[PDB]
């Protein structure tokens, strides 16, 4: 229950910026790269606001084994949300993914790392407030 | 607290299936499809599981306007874990996704409906593993 | 008395950076925007620093009237102040403008909203420190 | 505290009149001039006012130098204000601009005249009345 | 003993930055552009971090006389180290290079200003690291 | 506190010179090259004296591991003082960029091995006499 930073790194664009996770060595980057991409207004339509999120993590693999390979795992998020819409329904989604994850990662990743895709889900709703 | 029920809607594709969420009208879809790609050894290299999930949430604009517009709300989250890596190590990334989530929806959606990347994030370490 | 916030937005270029001030909404933008262009040496010339400065605040016209428009309100103001000027000459066209600006302000904008040019003007050069 | 008045030099047209600040010298001049675009009502969309001053300060550089070059230093500020806009956000915008101008001389010209790009701001939204 | 400072002037690109030391006007500019490469991963090779820092700081030649010229001192250290290495050997590379100039200013800049290549240097170990 | 040496190794060109470190091994081996072209003044126009000085370091890369890689670590510095200089400006530069390195290595290597790249440095100052 120890919480969590995360850092800035170098700008990469005007849009993108690379963030350090405190796991993140130089050897094996740990890194969350977001990308916010503005909504820009079309003639009579309203934007869309773009949100990419690459969290990355390095891991070695047969580190004990001559052949060794610095292999990354991979967690992208992208969000797209259209201007106008309600921050119900925003908050909505996003506690369903979050939901969805974290009962995921209860299931011993179990969809993720060996490909079973169950006929129906459940997750649990969460509630959580400031 | 309601556990979010999703049903398994049909079969898209071999590797491709479509579920539906609770609030799916056939009017306003509400969606989540989740293709998991079987990780395909290569010579000299273990294959690597991709896992792509998106859930749509279709919301209308301007209801009571006579010019009304239906358009999604999006999540995806792809997850690629190479062959090999540890359980830890996946929860670990998951872990910190779900929680970043968590901390936006508790930021009032700052970066993701307003586009504000804050220099440095602070997300709570989630403990509702269980 | 309570101080304003600016906050950092986006970062468009190495000149240009787009700011939020603490009225802004997504739907209602209101920014300060503010570029510096640097003095480049001439032969023999010094430079000018130009900082040109455009703050637009968005908003709505006859909200609850079905024919609504979302128009910005602009003040731009850009400052050519050459090498090598004395300071306290700066300080004192910064300390004319805003005084005027103030006392438009104090005028209820008979020059800026009805465009009544007036013969003669006074301001007060007030002196305001830390 | 002693007010400084604005004297009418020429009125060179229906938009644009010239005035001398008390600093002026005819061999360096030390103006300004202001120019009011009224509003001009379109088919269905209300006009804009657009009054645009332009403040320039004539100094001499290197007076004991026989290389001496007498260069303006100038402080141009642009208001476009839509017809139908509440007073209030006028009176916002300006004193948010005074405000700001005034902070910069307070911080002794660094954005202005060293060209350092800050990465948050801070101005006193201070109420000055008659 | 006054501690160096050195300012952020602006943000040249994602990799380059440019720094204004203490001595920095804007007629004979002294600069500090710092750019850092961060490793590419190679198919079988760890990335090398490439740091490149040059000092520059302009000085006059012959200001009484007529003719006289505006000319660049610069320093320039290039540092690229190896993803793995041990920070004792970049720190035992980095003292050397301080201690060897340290010990050239020390010389009274023989091989600097004058070209002497000695046989034999001798440069003192550096213990004010603390 | 041990003083360090430095001596002659083959010369490779007129204006090239190769010196051996004390750390050096024929296997690892650790070498600093200096070369110093002399200034050739042009018509009307003094010379300028160039110095550049590459140190660099082998490391053995995961000696234990099968995978073996001989790496090297470099710290190259190019130093270009015009003819005419004051000696005092070219301490200067020289005290500067040793204080930097050195104040690098109490840091850490944050910036050489990690790419972190602050808003604001300080270097304290260095003075040290025979
Ligand atoms: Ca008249
Ligand atoms: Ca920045």
Do not use: C, W
């Not at 934007?47 to 292999?71: D, P, W, Y």
């Not at 309600?86 to 993914?97: F, I, N, S, W, Y």
Request: charged share 25%; no cysteine; glycine share 6%.
């Amino acid at each position: 229950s120890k919480p969590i930073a995360i850092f800035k790194l170098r700008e990469l664009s005007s849009d993108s910026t690379l963030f350090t996770l405190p796991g993140h060595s130089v050897t094996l980057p740990n890194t969350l790269g977001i990308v916010s991409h503005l909504p820009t207004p079309r003639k009579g339509n309203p934007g869309t606001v773009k949100t990419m999120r690459n969290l990355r993590k390095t891991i070695l693999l047969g580190a004990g084994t001559a052949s060794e390979r610095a292999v990354p795992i991979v967690i992208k998020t992208e969000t797209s949300f259209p201007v106008g819409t309600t921050e119900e329904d925003r908050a909505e989604v996003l506690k369903q993914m979050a939901s969805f994850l974290i009962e995921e990662v209860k299931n011993n990743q179990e969809l993720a790392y060996s490909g079973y895709v169950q006929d129906k889900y459940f997750i649990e709703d969460l509630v959580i407030t400031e």
